[model samples]
Every structure is written in C-alpha cells, then in structure tokens.
Target chain A: SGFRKMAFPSGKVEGCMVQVTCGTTTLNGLWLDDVVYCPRHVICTSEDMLNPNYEDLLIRKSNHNFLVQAGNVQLRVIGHSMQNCVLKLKVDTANPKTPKYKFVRIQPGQTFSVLACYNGSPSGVYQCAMRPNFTIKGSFLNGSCGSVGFNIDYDCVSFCYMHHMELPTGVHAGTDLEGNFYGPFVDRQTAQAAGTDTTITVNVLAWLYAAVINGDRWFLNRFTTTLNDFNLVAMKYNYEPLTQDHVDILGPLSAQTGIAVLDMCASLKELLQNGMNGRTILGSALLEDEFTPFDVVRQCSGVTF
Target chain B: SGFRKMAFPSGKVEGCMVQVTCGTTTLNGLWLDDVVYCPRHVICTSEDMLNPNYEDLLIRKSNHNFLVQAGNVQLRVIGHSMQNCVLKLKVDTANPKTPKYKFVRIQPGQTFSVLACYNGSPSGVYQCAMRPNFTIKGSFLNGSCGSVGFNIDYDCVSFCYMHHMELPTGVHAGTDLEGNFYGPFVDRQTAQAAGTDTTITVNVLAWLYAAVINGDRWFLNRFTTTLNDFNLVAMKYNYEPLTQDHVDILGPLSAQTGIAVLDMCASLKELLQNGMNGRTILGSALLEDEFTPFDVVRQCSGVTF
Candidate 1:
C-alpha cells in the first residue's frame, strides 16, 4: 500500500500536532510538498470574503508518526504561504536521565524547525534546516538536543554501607586501597610520620550521662518576685528608676531634707517617665498625698527621667 | 463822657456797637446787644484773644469798671461739622476739695449775646440765642456739650496707689456689704472656700531635701544603672528604644533569652530617671563602661526641673 495518512487520538499522541484531523489511516506516511490546501475548501466568493472568519483557509496535517519512534524526526515545508501559521511540537522520553534538551530563540515570523537522529552507537549528531534561516547544528548526547545511557550496576554507592560494622569499643576503621588491610601503631611521633592519626579516644560511659543537673527555678522565682515588686512600686508612684547623675544631684538634696526619698523619687520618676514637667507634676498629684518630709529630699534630688 | 461811643483801636464804635478785635484785651463786662467781632482786627493777632492784648475797649468808673475776664480758656471744635462747637470755660473757686470749674460744649455759630452772673461756682447758667440754630437756656458747665476735666492730684495719686499694691505677695483685701474686712486666707482650703485662693504651696522642701535624705538618690542610681545595662545589651544586639511601649515589650525578651534581666531592669530604670532614653542613652554609652545598675536606677528616678 502507498504511504497513508494517519490520525492519532488526543490521549495517545505526545507531539504538538495531535489536534490535526485525518481522513484515512494510510495517509500517515504520505509526504506532500507545500500545497496550499485547506481541510474544507469551499468556493471563494465576495460574500465569503465579506463575512470571512479565516478558519476555512486553515490547513491541517495528519498524525506526526515519527515522534513515536526512538529515532530522529524531521519536517520540511516548501512553497507555502505560512502567514500567521503556528507550528508546535512535543516530545516525551521514558527515562529522564537518558535525554536532555536545550532551545534557542528564533527571529520573529520565521519558521521554527528541528531534527532529531538516533545512532546505534552511544553518541550521534543531528542537523536541521529552515528556509529563511540556516539551522544551527548540535548533538544528540551532550549538546542542544541529546540523550545518554544509564546503568545501575556501574554507579557508585553511598558511604553508609559500613554503618553496621562491628569492632572493638572506641576503635575506628580507616579505609585503604582495595578495602583490605588494617593495622595499629604506638607513639605519637611514629603515627604522625605514617599519616594514620584518624583514631579518636573516647569514654562512652562518661559521655552517656555527662550533663550537669541544676534547678534554677528558685532563683527564677526570687528574681521574678523582685521584678514584680519593683514594677508594682514603680507603677504605684509612677516612679521610674534613676540614673547616676540624677542620684548625684538629688542625693545631697535628699540627705539634707532627711526624708525617705525613694517613694517620692519613684513618684517623680514615674511622672517624668510619662513625659511630665512643671505644672504637670503639681497638677497630677497622684503621689501628692504620699509626700512627706522625706519627699522633700526626693523632690530635691529631682527626677532625671 | 455821657455814654460816648467807645472808639477802640481798630475802628470807631457807635451806639452799643462793640467790636471785639484780635488784640483788644480789656472787654470785660461790656454788654452790647449787637457786637461786631473779628479775631484779626486787633493789632496783635497772636496775643491771647480775650486778655491783655489790646487797649481797653470801654473805660468806666472805679466802682463800675468793665471787668472783662476770659470767657473760655480753650475752644475746640471736636466733630467734623461747624455745628459741633465745644466751649471750655475757666473759673476760679476758693474751695480746693470740691471741683472749681467745668467746661461745656456749645452749638457752633451761636453768637455770644449776653453775660451771665458769676457766683465763683460752676452752677452759673447762660443762654445762646442767634443764627446757626440757637438755644434758649444752657449751663456754664454744659452737661450736653463735650467737656473733659483735667485733674493733677487724683490722677497722680491713683496711679501711685495702684503701682504699690500690684505685687504678687500682697494681700488683696476685699470687703463685704457691711464694709466688713475679708480675707487674705491663711491656707488654700480657707482661701478656696472664700473664693480668694491665690497662693502656691509648693512642697519644695519635701521634694528637694527629703528625697535626698530618704534614699531617692539611691533608687535613682539603681534605676539608671539598670537602664544603662539594658541599653548596652540592646545596643550589642542592635536595638532601639523608640517608645516606652517598645522598651516594655522588648525588654523582657532580652532577659528571657538569658541576658541579665535584673541588670537590664536596673539600667532601664536608671536611664528613665536620667531622662536618657532613645538617642541620649545610645550616645553616652561610650563614656562610661562600668556604670553601677543602682546608679542608673537612681538617676532615672529623679525629676527634671
């Protein structure tokens, strides 16, 4: 039978031309030169021109059968008015490790074409051609479009194989060429000269439970309580703490006044912490009632915050 | 000289035709029904219009002498029209306690027709009647006219008394309906009750001297030191104290993360009292490395003046 056109259903075809419709299966291998042919070519008329939908003139191809093969695939378009024609192709490799692909940018409105070739040998080269632009050649193995073979037996294994090896306690086995022999040496000078100082000395029992147990809970409780007290006093009188300079200035003043300056100090400190001064202090007498002769010292000391 | 026509310097006078010229000084008590007058008609126009400028217009017997006195010291036209004339009369009185004389306002263009009696009192009344809208009766102290009294003693005494009593500490004594004396109240409460509270009872001694004697300085010192420590730790970790809320929230985190929580608290309190948060704390860290936490707290507790 002559070459026949074939159509692959959407589910089976991997290439981009799966949308094309076919009339007969024998047309699969049929090759045609760029014949300006449409699937449905009705009469060209003025009314058709006036109400042109542009769909009637679209050309469709039969199934792209060669992409299913393990070898290369190629397409040639000749003497065609491909105005806004879009050509799409797809590929699938059963093993991802076998083939790798690379793409290049093509000029606008130029035909995008590529060719693939399969050689029986481990490596092969492929070439492609376009009408308006020259094809850049690459490889099928380690180039723009290529494949490589893989075998599980020739691959190297990870270093975790000796995880279950049994030996004397604290003895570490070092790997040698061909994985055969082992030895020991005494004296640090000799070991250094031989370049075999990989052994580590350890005490297993000591390391098993060497952590120190401490109960900081009590300290923490005291600390938290102290902090809480401070906070309560601070908030109560709006007293913030003071600085050394503040102490220096007000210290003498408090001394002279003979007052328990801490409370007023705290109150004034709190007031200042809230960004108060002058009349605001006298205005908000939050601690005014708490003031005593001691407060004279505190006030004299003055709030720095 | 049986009623001979008075011949003044400027013109020859006829029966009851008196010309009161600019320089005619002596024209006291000369009654004339029709008096022709001109200010520039006398020889000395710059002299006082009514006194000592010209020869006597009419001479008389010793007992019946024409005693011409100045009718008004100054005559001013106050308003924007000729009809608004103010006549300022000059009178002499014996009693120094009561007012001696008063000026009065008269309608403009009213001819001076008749002489009124002088009782050396301000109650003498006169009437102006003629063209420019005449009036029937009016007082020497014209109540309806524009007249302003000038007092030397009362003005000076009133100003001096007000100045002496305007001091801040001066007691503002008030009176009741029965002329009973009222406060300067002894204290704020009493003053407030009587609605005369004006004193400021600043607890200066309490705030200044007592605070110092009562350990306000110590508190501030601790607080400031604490804040500094906190700030140092924060700066080591590249933090900022932008707001009190920021410090309040982030402060405990540094402590919980094994940073000295108490030290941080003390330093923070100190910084607060020193009024040294934000940039001041950051800037001053270079000067002092070993600030006692208490110092910081104390400084923080002190108030700004």
Candidate 2:
C-alpha cells in the first residue's frame, strides 16, 4: 500500500495529468498524459528523453513497480564507469523484435542478473543484490517533425551488489564462491607459519636468487615471506606461465635444490583442490570489484608458473 | 572511560614492552622496546618500516593520543590519488630542522587541515571535517646494517571532510562557503527558470550559434538552458577564460542586442558578487572532492568566460 520511492523530478513535465495513490496519499505523474491509478507508493522522475545516456534502474520488487508507455525507450547493455564492472540484461518479451523496455514482463519467481562493463568491453560477473527485482513496462514515442524522444520508468532502494562468478558444480565441490572451509584449515595455517619460519627457508632464498639471475627486476623493490607471496611478485613482473625460458632456467635450479618452481598456474590448481584454504581469491575478488587494485592474480588462471 | 578502537595489528611486532590502560581495560604496544604506561586506550599496529610508502594518520584529539620513539619516520606533504585533493601539513617544533613526527604538538583548540593530491600534483582547497584532531609524538631510529627502518604512531575515527575555498572577508560578505543566501534567491531562481524560459531566450541561442561558428565543437554534444549553464559547457571545453577571439566576435553581437557576452571570466565575478545566489560553486567543490567530475567552473576564477 505504498508508492515506489523515486528521485524528486528534474527537467520538463508534460503530457496528460496522471495520478496514482498510495494508501491515503495520492501520487501524481510527473510525465505523460494519463491519470493512472495505483495502490503502491509511486515515485516520479523525469529526464531529457533525447539525451544519449543510460539510466541505471535497480527495479526492486518490494511494493514497487514501474509503468511506462508511449516513449522511445530502448534497453541497451553498454559500458559505464561505475566501478568498471561489466553489465548484462535478460528479458522475456511478447514481441522478440521489440526490446525489453517495450513489452517485457517479469513474472513472480523469475529473475535476471545485471552485468558490468570492464575496459569498455561488454562482460559480466554474477551479481547478487538485496531485494527482489521489478519490471519495466513501456513503449516508444513516435513523432512529429524536428525531433523525437521517450519516457521510461524504474525504481530501487540501494546499490549493494557483489561481483564474482560461481564455480562449476562439483569442480570445487561443496565450497561456496568465497571458498568456505571449516575447522583448522591446517594447510593454510602451516603455509602462513612457514612465511615467518626462519629455518627451512632455503626454497624462498633459492627462488629469489633465481629471480635475480633471471634478469627480472621485480625483486629490486619487492619483499615477501613465502614462496606463494614471491610467486605473486614474479607473475606481476612476467605474467602468465613465468615465460618458458625463465621457468626452464628455474627448472634446473629447482631440481638441484629439490624444490619446485612455485608458479601461479600450479598454485591456483593447488588452491582450488585444497578448499581454497588461504582464501586469497576471496580478497582479490572483493578488492577488484570495489577498486581496481594491483592486477596480480586476476588472469593467472589462463597460464602456468 | 573507554578504549580507542584500533584495527587488528598486521606485520611484525618488535621492541615495545609498553602497556597502557583504558579505564578497567589494559592496552599494550606493538613496537618499540619499552613497557611504558598510560591512561587513554592505546592501539597496536606494525608495518614494514623499510618499505617506501606514506601512511595517512588523521590524528584526532578526543581520548586518542599517539606516542612513538626510536624510528626512521619522516613527514612529507605530497600528491596522492585519494580524491585528487592536495595535502598540506603545518607543525610547531622546538627544533625546526626536525620533522613533525619527531616532535610536533597539536594542542587542544588548535588544528590543521589535511590536503589532497590531484593528477600527481599537490594542491588544496580549504577543508572542514568532523571531530577534534589528534597529535603525533615520536623520534627516528637511526643506524642499521644493510637497511634502516622506523616506527610511527597515529590514530583516527573516519575520513569525512569538505573541500572548498572560503571567500575573502567582506568580498562575498556574510555568505557561507556553500554560498548561503537569504530570501527566495530570486536571482538564482530567475536564472534557473530562464533555462526553461522560451521567450527572452535569445542570449542562449546567440551564444550557441556563436560557439558553432567559432569551430568550438563543444556545443556539438552539449545542451543547456541558461547563459550561466552554457558558460560551464564552454569552460569544460576550454579550461580558462573564453578566448579573446571568441569573446571579441560575440562582443559585436552582444552590443547589437544590448546583451553582454556571457563570458565565464565576467560571470565568475558576477557570481561571487551576487551572494553566489545559484550556488553552483558549492556543487563543483563537492563533486570534485568526492569524484573528479567534469572539471567545469573549477579554476574558472583565474580566467574570463
């Protein structure tokens, strides 16, 4: 029994006088020429119909529904600079030729995940939000000479959605997207302790010495405690598989020392197989989604150490 | 009567055997070898002292005071990418040669505003923040084998502050930094309404037409209602005063219609004199401080429209 919460209207108000009601309060339309009636709170907002820009509509389903008719409102999934995440949209339309905004109906229990824009390319990660999503009901405005425009409707409460992909079923089996693990996580604890362990630290030193001889200047300004941490530094300097020539050189030294090259490619597989014991993946995913931090472990899955 | 909340400690813990108390609770030091005592709650944090980086310490006053001794800590005012605002620091020291962290006291009733970094350049606007500021007390740790390090102390609650310059006394007299004004702000209202005003809109059209002819394609993708708004569009294209050639051309047309060439150069002067009636200055300052939005109207005071 309330109107959808909407931003206070800006720009021109035209067309027929449309009125809706939320309980005892009456909601008046700020655009179009129809006096539509309503039971929920209806928030009214108007914008320059012809301006080339995308309006991000969260379209929450809690007592909020948007209705638009007679406007040149087209739905397009494009790139934007909001946290630089990719964006995507899916819809169910009576007319497949018409865009989602034109005659799409999102019935109860149905949903679509919105994507993000990464580096100006259309890509997306699975998005999870707080409230149930809503629908867009509208049509384009065809018109007179000189110029043309449109009207669209939408709603939302907040912008709190997470960006990360879910693992394939039975792959990382039973683990959540964050790689939830129970109990001691002994392997991770052992690795973390080894970072501080002075004795038996020959492998780290050997790796550093090898990195130095490899002509990789990444070690010049970097410091690390574990082979895993050192591996990040190496990948940062020489991305993907550590360059076969470099690894070929390390292969000999690693064999001589009875140590393995802790390449990121092998490390990722180890992590996945071990319940993501360290959960460094969780941290990277969140940090990049919030702010593009140092791209250390992002694309490492594509290559080896 | 309470403990000062501190982030969970990270990195190595050394020297400090120091311990303090917060009411019934006891607090301990994470660095420096001393079992010193205290009244206010002391939080513990440690970092890689040898690494090159700047740590922003808010230094709030309240029940929080930081103490440090024996560390290679240096104070510097430099550019950083946190909202691109320039940062500045002022300190009072008995030995002027010694930096602030070595021995600087910001007593009660006194405060210094922090600046920001913009485009790797240091610049500042007057800043206002919540809560009383804090102080830094410490000395450097000189002498080491192959490398040297330091330990510094600081504390804070939140990072919320306003960025804008205050007008000179009696210049924009009695108006607050956000350009506070009395009455209906009728002048501003008139300007805003004029954006929608069809008749008496000759000046806006005249300016757009002129911009088109000047080969200043800025108007090609922009639209506006008021001469003032259009001035912003022009400033966005050309960072300073509208060029003399552009203004000189408009000078004839403005003279013909008895309307002035709505130059941003003259407009800024008019705005400052008129009680900042529209308060667009307020919007620009907040926008740039929060996110580097289109740099319109900023640095416009240095040039003409």
Candidate 3:
C-alpha cells in the first residue's frame, strides 16, 4: 500500500507532477499537476496516455495500487477507481475560448424539450420557448473540469398532426384537400356516395405515414424524419408498431436535422386552417362565419375535388 | 523577387516546406506543404505563423514580396495583397471533424431570416420553415476547405408586439389586465375616469419598455433583450429612439439568449385570449360567446381592477 496526504487544509501547493515507472522506461500515466492543489484532481494531464501503445501497459499493470490524497477528495489508481472522483470539480473551461454553441431546430408555433449532458453528467430539463428566431444560449449543462465534452437528447418533443375532416356527401374518394386531408371520404359520404365510384381514401396524417412507409420520394423529400411524429401518434392510437431500430435512427436524425416533419406538419396545417373556402357544402356556399376548425378541408385553397 | 512554381499540372507534390531567415534566426512564415497540390493554393501550412512574435515580423517586412504560384491560383505575400488570392481556394475542412452547427432562435408564431458566411464569403438566403422542435442540420454554408470559419447574421429576424387595448370606463390607473393591458383607461374610459383617480397608466408594451429602460431588475430578469422587439416596433411607430449601441447589444443577445420578450408576449397573449372573464360590460356579464380576438382584456382571468 502506497499513499501520501500532506496538508493543513492548505489550498496552496507549487507545481508538482506524478510519474510512475515499472523499470527504466517510464509508462505513460494520468495525473493532476501544474497547479497549487496537489491532489484536487481538478485537472487531468497525461503524457501520451491516450495513445494505443500505452493502453496495454496500463491494463497489464492493473495490479499495482496507488492512492492520491487531497483535502476532501482521494483518487485511487486501481484497475479503475473513483472515490467521489474529481471529475465533478467545477472547472471553468470557458475562458479565452468559449465552448462551441449547439443548435436544436424547432419550427414556429411548435414546442420542444431538451436534455443535455456534459461529460456524462445529466442536466436539468430545459423548457425552451417555442420561437422561430429564438436561440438557446448557455454553456455545457454539467460540464467536466478539463476538456469538457457534451451531448443533447432531442427525443423529448412530440408532435400532433391529425388531418380530421368533414366532407360533402357526394365528394369523390381520390380528391385531395390542401395536402392535409384526402378522399375515400368518411362518415356520411361513404354510404351516400357508394355505387358511383369505388376507391380507397385516407386522411393527411395516414397518407403521410403511408407515403413515408411506402417510400414516396416526393413526400419524403418534403420533410425530414416524419416517422418520429408518426411513431408517437401510432403508439397512442394503436396505428403502427415501431421497433428499437426505428427509435435509434429517429433520435440522432431529430437532433442533427431540423426542418423535418414538424415544419411540414405546421405548414400543411397552416394552409388548411387559414386558406380560402370556396366549395359549397349542404347545397349552399360555405361561409367563413360558419366554418369550424375541424372544417379545414372545406376551407383549404389547395383542395382540388 | 522570391517566387516559386513547380511542375506539369502536377497534383503530386509531397512534403515540401518553406523556411525564411531575416538574420541567423529563422523568421516564422506561412507556406503550404504536405500533399501534392503545390500550385493549386489548396493547403496552407506554417509553423507558429499565427503566433504574435511572427505577426509583428510579417507586418514589419511589408516591403518584401513573396509570390506562391499554384495552378489556377496564386498566393502573393505582400504588405496587403491578393491576385485572385489563394484564400478563396476550396479546401475540405470538415473531415474526421465536422464543423460546429450553430443556432439562431426566433419564437414560435414568429418568422426569422438567416444570412451566413463561411470564411467571410456570403451565402444565399435560407427560408427555414418555422417548427418548434426542428434542428437545422447542414454544415457551414460556403465553407472553406481547411480550418473554415463562419458566423450567422441574426439581425434579419424582427418582432411585432403592441399592447393595444380597449378598456372600460372608470378603470383606475395601475389596473392590470392580465399583464397585457394597463389602465389610465384609454378612449372611452379616459374622459369617464378623469375626475375619478387622475392617474396615468401605460400599455403593457410601453410599460415593459419603460421597465427595461428604467433598469427594473424584475422586468429585466423576466426576459433577455426584450428591446430587440421594442426597437423595431418603436422605429415603425415612433415610440422610442434606439441608438446603434442598443442594436449592437440586442443582436448578440437575441442570437445568444432566447426566452426574452417574444415568449413573454406570447404567454401573456395566450393567457389574455383564453382565460376566464368575470368582468361585466354594458350592464351584462361578458359572455365567452360574445368575445372577439380584440376582447382579450375582458376575457383574461388575471384582470384585477
């Protein structure tokens, strides 16, 4: 057993470095040096310790036990060790060099959630306000003392994209309604328009999901990772099954790329919600005053029936 | 004239370096070495060329002209010179390490603009669709080949906020209407409440602006760079004068920190537009069925006169 602790709660020490050798040639090692706190473990300095050549040596010498003692912390060099390891020390890495700012895109009118981790330490939930031009600015959530590394969890935000509709009695099944709703018209229209024509129809959400699953290039190119939204909605309503692989791909894609499904959903919704209403319903022209939010298909300018 | 050009559209030059001397000590200088693209001005290499010691020497030797001629490009080292400079040469900087992605935040229901430059070269307009949980995931626009540098122009996005209100008669000053409207009782109420209280009140936008300008910590902490929104509105409506210094602070602040005014405005608007309405009007209790979008003051649950 080899260990040393020399101090009077004194926070001052001169430049001291730790070096160990089994023989004449010194093996690469990691230690905290170049500061007054001899054993604080606030800084990590290793001479070529990350190199492949020294990795084997470190593992082979795993039996050798060494202990470094400081005021309130102790670092043990065993096979692998940490006694409240100094990795949690609050070290300001953002001086003379600011940590690179990261981006997470969410379109206007949508909300998102953020979970960040700095050097493996998890951060609190970040309730980023939904803004088209609002940038989130802060440093690493729970950064490490030296050369901090971090990542974001973008799996938190969810979407609600339903293309509910109310169609006229005689509308055809193949008709498209502002890209948000489609024909094979439901409810009263199914029985009312029966013998005239027989064709399969779908709502915008279902059609979009089908388009993505069936690999429709046009629909796919219009949005990014639309499946993330579909997966949630699917599970919620028992529409489809998503495997772990699907989730694995979706998370990275969502975090790395914005302008995916959420924007497409919003844009299509906007078109249907706010555009023109020229079609006649119930044998009379549909008035703006009489329209409900559910009546978007009848209101959409892009509706071609 | 120290000039050099080497071989046959030769794309295979290997490990050639340039060293210069003012006296006995080798003065630091920049040169492209390693890999064959000598005349292409494709790679830049120099040992400590960016250090301050070499910076002064390079500037002091303004009279010295050194020419590096590469195929389709030329790097002329003069006091300040360029001949279709090699600085514009294409180089791949994002390999093994991707350039850091950036963010420009704008609140939901709002629109923003982006102007980017890779290594000082301007990029085309990007009409990023507005989405709440979207992440913009493309590498630098107009990036450089080696060690490319870039920045975003956040000044393009603007905001629209106004606490335009319609208050009832006899409402006293400091009467807050869901934090969106304050009453000296405008229009009908001003004349009606004249002898009643003789107090002055301001709209929420004006009050917020005043709060910020007067250094109210509560108002300031509630949002980040709320003036960016105010400045544009003020300029448009002639409410207040924002100087260049105001803009300099606002742009960086808006790009760096979100959850500022836009969120506050949206939240307040949501509360006023959707909450309870117990107030009376025209000798009748205000009905939700009779409310208009402009009737938020009468609808807000936070209204306490």
- Reference contacts reproduced by model 2: 0.00
lDDT of 3 by residue, A183-280 (tens): 23331212333222211111233223322332232322343335455454444332224444434433322333333435434333432344324332
Could you give candidate 1's per-residue lDDT for residues A29-128 as a string of tens digits? 1111221111121121334433434345334332342222222443322222222211222233222222122223322111111111112111111111
State the C-alpha lDDT per candidate: 0.21, 0.21, 0.23
- iRMS per model in Å: 65.3, 26.2, 35.4
Report the first chain's TM-score for all candidates.
Answer: 0.15, 0.17, 0.19
The C-alpha TM-scores of every prediction are 0.12, 0.16, 0.18
TM-score of chain B of each: 0.14, 0.17, 0.18
Give me the candidate number with maximum lDDT.
Answer: 3
**Candidate number with the higher lDDT (1 or 3):** 3
lDDT of 3 at A7: 7
TM-score of 3: 0.18
Residue B114 lDDT in candidate 2: 26
Chain A of model 2 scored by TM-score: 0.17
In candidate 2, position A244 carries an lDDT of: 42
Give the per-residue Cα lDDT of candidate 1 at A60. 38
